[PDB]
């Protein structure tokens, strides 16, 4: 199986799972630990912000790749905003300072 850019899930803007659904492989938690264990920092940043979640980040990425640029505009994971809405939907007031 192989995937460049397919469909995206609805509640958390991440790619779908499986093969029949044209999906991408789960860059799981222990692989995140194994990239923290090297000094690979930009590889992990695009591995969990640009390639996966941030929608404006990945459209900027796709334009930059088809123009030869090779550069990422990072932004924020949208699933972290989902975490803010689920914690905020309790009586808890989570924010982002400064």
């Amino acid at each position: 199986h192989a995937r460049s850019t397919g469909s995206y899930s609805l509640v958390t803007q991440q790619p779908l799972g499986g093969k029949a659904q044209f999906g991408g492989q789960r860059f799981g938690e222990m692989e995140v630990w194994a990239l923290e264990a090297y000094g690979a920092a930009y590889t992990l940043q695009e591995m969990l912000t640009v390639k996966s979640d941030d929608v404006n980040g990945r459209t900027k990425m796709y334009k930059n790749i088809v123009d030869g640029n090779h550069q990422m505009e990072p932004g924020m994971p949208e699933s972290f905003n989902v975490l803010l809405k689920e914690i905020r939907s309790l009586g808890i007031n989570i924010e982002l300072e400064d």
């Binding site: 923290e36 690979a40 920092a41």
Partner: peptide
């Protein structure tokens, strides 16, 4: 703030 990003976090911690 460990690997390649330790220079970035040095820069951000210096520029506060």
């Amino acid at each position: 703030p460990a690997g390649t990003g330790y220079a970035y976090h040095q820069d951000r911690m210096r520029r506060r």
